[PDB]
Amino acid sequence: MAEDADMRNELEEMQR
Amino acid sequence: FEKMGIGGLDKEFSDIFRRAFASRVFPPEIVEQMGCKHVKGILLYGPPGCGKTLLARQIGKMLNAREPKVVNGPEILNKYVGESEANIRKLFADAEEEQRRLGANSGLHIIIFDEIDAICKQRGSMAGSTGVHDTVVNQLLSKIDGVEQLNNILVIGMTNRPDLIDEALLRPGRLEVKMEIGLPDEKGRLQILHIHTARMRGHQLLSADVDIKELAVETKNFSGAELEGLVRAAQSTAMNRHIKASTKVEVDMEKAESLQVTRGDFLASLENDIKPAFGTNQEDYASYIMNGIIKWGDPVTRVLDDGELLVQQTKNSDRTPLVSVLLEGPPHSGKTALAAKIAEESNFPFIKICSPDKMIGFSETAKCQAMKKIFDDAYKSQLSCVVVDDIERLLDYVPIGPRFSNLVLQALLVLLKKAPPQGRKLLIIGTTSRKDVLQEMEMLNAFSTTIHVPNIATGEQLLEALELLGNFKDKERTTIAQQVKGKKVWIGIKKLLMLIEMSLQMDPEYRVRKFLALLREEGASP
Amino acid sequence: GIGGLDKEFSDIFRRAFASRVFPPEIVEQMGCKHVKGILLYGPPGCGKTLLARQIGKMLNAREPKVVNGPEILNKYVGESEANIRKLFADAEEEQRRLGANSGLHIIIFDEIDAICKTGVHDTVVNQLLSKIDGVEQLNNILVIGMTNRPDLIDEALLRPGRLEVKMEIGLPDEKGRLQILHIHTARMRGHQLLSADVDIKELAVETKNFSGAELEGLVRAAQSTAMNRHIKASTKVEVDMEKAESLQVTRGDFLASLENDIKPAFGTNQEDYASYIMNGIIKWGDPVTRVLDDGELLVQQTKNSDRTPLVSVLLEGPPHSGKTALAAKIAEESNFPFIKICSPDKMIGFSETAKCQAMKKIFDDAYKSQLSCVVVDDIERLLDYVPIGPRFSNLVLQALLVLLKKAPPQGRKLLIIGTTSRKDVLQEMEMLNAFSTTIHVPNIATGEQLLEALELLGNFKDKERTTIAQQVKGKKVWIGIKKLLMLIEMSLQMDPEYRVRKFLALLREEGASP
Ligand SMILES: Nc1ncnc2c1ncn2[C@@H]1O[C@H](COP(=O)(O)OP(=O)(O)OP(=O)(O)O)[C@@H](O)[C@H]1O
Ligand SMILES: Nc1ncnc2c1ncn2[C@@H]1O[C@H](COP(=O)(O)OP(=O)(O)OP(=O)(O)O)[C@@H](O)[C@H]1O
Ligand SMILES: Nc1ncnc2c1ncn2[C@@H]1O[C@H](COP(=O)(O)OP(=O)(O)O)[C@@H](O)[C@H]1O
Predict the structure, then answer these.
(1) Which residue in the set A1, A4, A5 is minimally distant from B132, CB to CB?
(2) Phi/psi of residue C340, nearest 5 degrees
(3) Can chain B be said to touch chain C, i.e. do they have 3 or more Cβ pairs within 8 angstroms?
């Protein structure tokens, strides 16, 4: 079984 | 070792102290003066339910070690890249940090791997034919013994397939001690009953009518888990007998509470609750013998006597630990009932039946695996009997062609010659209906003996069979006898039963005529 | 307040509450454990919640705690896991204070699959697992969960000591549905806005596999069909206002709505049993009667025999002789609880493995009833066979040969009927010896039988029948009924003058001898 490929990511910003 | 709660394995610990833990108790000064490193790990293998994890949890507690990190092999695997390696690496951080902090004055850490064979397998040498999980093996090998040395760790692996493990993991630097935990003998079975009945004896709920020494004999191929289950089922049966009896009779509860201590609870559980995985079954003989055995002639006695002689030979021989026999005859003769009867009368601890009824739709490789599994299980007992039913149906034979499966044929030919480990004895019985094909395939010289199962071939034999079945009356009996007194009959018992049933469906008057017509329509010579 | 689950309630009591009666002292010396995990699965219905309330009633338990859906989930960090620990605060306090002599705790989870099955979900699952079974062990806590998709639950939750009892719950049925229908229809019945032609029993029977939102949905739809008669839109939004003085709901307004407006969500019980009988059965001779009598004799044997629980038969005949219909007729007349037909029509393009699985599943279903009957037709098509070579599939043949002599569980009866048109091939393959008996289905032989068949069909009148009898009566014929119907239909197309000549012409080409 071929291991799952790499993935991107999504980011969320927070305000102080 | 029986004072920690484990009974039946005293030599398999007495060796574990010499070859592994002698240097962990000797005074440190001389040990350092010698300059000897400690053993790093051990491997345990045997049938399941025999007390491997229990012993592992006690070895650590005996050396004043910290709480063990238990890991299950099948759970570590993950589908994303680099996750399994991270999981493997995470079980050594606390030991690395403690060593780096405290030098040579650190404690001891224990790691317990369960089903280790599921994540470590021989790495493929061929280019392009590498295994799926080679990276896991590489990571484990690097961690156990690498460029930076750890001297405060111990690893215990548990498995049931010691021949699939990679070799580089078993060299004298890694996991160099190996032990086997087999099925308990009578003594071990007495000790495990004592240990599990100590509590009830202490609280005074063990009656005087219960004799553990007797119960030891009745459990022949029982494991520890199954004995515990038996005790628990006996307690539950006692409670049920208490509740039912009290709710039906107006006697004081306390008197009934004293009465739950009985032995009848024990015998009732030994029959209806517990089913050993290495013992003899009683639910299959009913399936394969649905109408008993009626003695309609002499040949039955001859067949049974030959079977008895073969059983005695296999039981009382030293130069021939393996014995084989084939039962062959025409169709519908009843070769699967006689083979089951012989097996039942053998009185061996381990009796198993392999039939194609439970392999519908399987591919040939699956069938090979199933047969191999059954024989591997059979090898663990001291007296075994196995039954291979049909044979022409396991091979997928068809006259057109001909066609069949070669893999199963070769597996059978190899299995009919392999002997069990030293001191253990096995018997094999096969049943076919086409011996000419087997002779052609050159299988008939792998067996040691052959027995012929004949058909009914005379009128008086048919009359005796009818009398023993008891279906027709005196007048019909006389009619049939006068009409079939000529000894020119050729019929099988299993077909005779079907003919009788079919005949009995007509009106009372028109029954003998239909039976005679059906018999006539049947063949009358080979 | 539920029927058909008495044995299920008995099992529930036996498994868990049967061990609760003894005082703590006797169990202490025993050391016996107690159940704390129960899982219920089954399509939607009021039974599961009613059962939960029933368990709440029977035992001297605290006011049960029930969570309605994924209320634990929160936007902030750590709050989703925070709701869990509040649940067991009282349990921990009672265990620490009163010890063993503490009241039972019952927890009800509704739609647990929503919360149990990424940082929120995995952390919640870990917290719940640790709280249910962690370093501290509680012996006075019970957790109950209800689901409709059991396969979507996490495996770890099913490990022993986490979820112990598995329960299947059946769906609601006709009489409850009728009660719900009555409760809804009460409002219109009270005000005489419902027509008297409507029968609630008929609609309750008709609606099958529908929930309450759908059951309201059917009624609402019916209502609409009425109001639209008073509206006068499509040019404006102005309405009659004179027909508004009165308004009622006729039966049809319901019926239309259940066909053309509202569809069930769980499908329906589709059957096309007629598919195998498209022209009935017409007695044109003795052989039909003989075949039916033999079938009845075979049926009675299966049902009354103690030594032969399994019986097999084979139907033989030349092509276009009508065997698939004569087998289905016998199966119908059997009057057994379970009847099924295996046909190659439903398996097109399948490989050998798929066919084997399909047959195995049908037989597995058959085994679970008391007495069953199964019919397999077109054996040569099932195990595809071609005269060239010849070529065929061995896997299916071996599966059939194994299945034809495997008895069902003790005390159950099975009947098998097979149909084919190539006896010699099967005899060569050594399968004809597996079947217990055989029957023969012949063609039309004499002209008298053909004339009787034509008379029964009633397609030709006396004038043409006279000429046909003159031509055919003095000769033997060899034709199958299906081909006869085809020929009649084909000849009927042309004008009335040429029909007889065309029919007689075709008959000669299709004529033959055995
Ligand atoms: N003396 C006997 N020997 C064998 N079977 C007997 C005898 N008396 C009664 N029977 C019954 O006859 C049946 C034997 O059929 P069995 O399954 O052994 O046939 P088989 O020889 O394996 O045939 P096949 O190859 O057709 O399956 C069983 O019901 C058995 O109870
Ligand atoms: N007495 C009868 N017996 C059988 N079929 C009849 C009879 N009367 C009318 N029919 C009709 O004849 C048709 C029989 O066709 P059927 O498909 O059953 O035949 P078949 O022999 O299985 O065909 P094939 O060899 O083409 O698969 C059905 O429409 C059945 O309704
Ligand atoms: N020799 C033994 N003495 C006492 N109890 C035993 C013994 N062997 C097995 N048992 C019982 O069986 C239980 C389950 O066996 P386990 O330790 O899990 O072994 P395995 O790893 O081989 O499955 C033990 O916890 C213990 O209760």
Answers:
(1) A1
(2) -145, 150
(3) yes
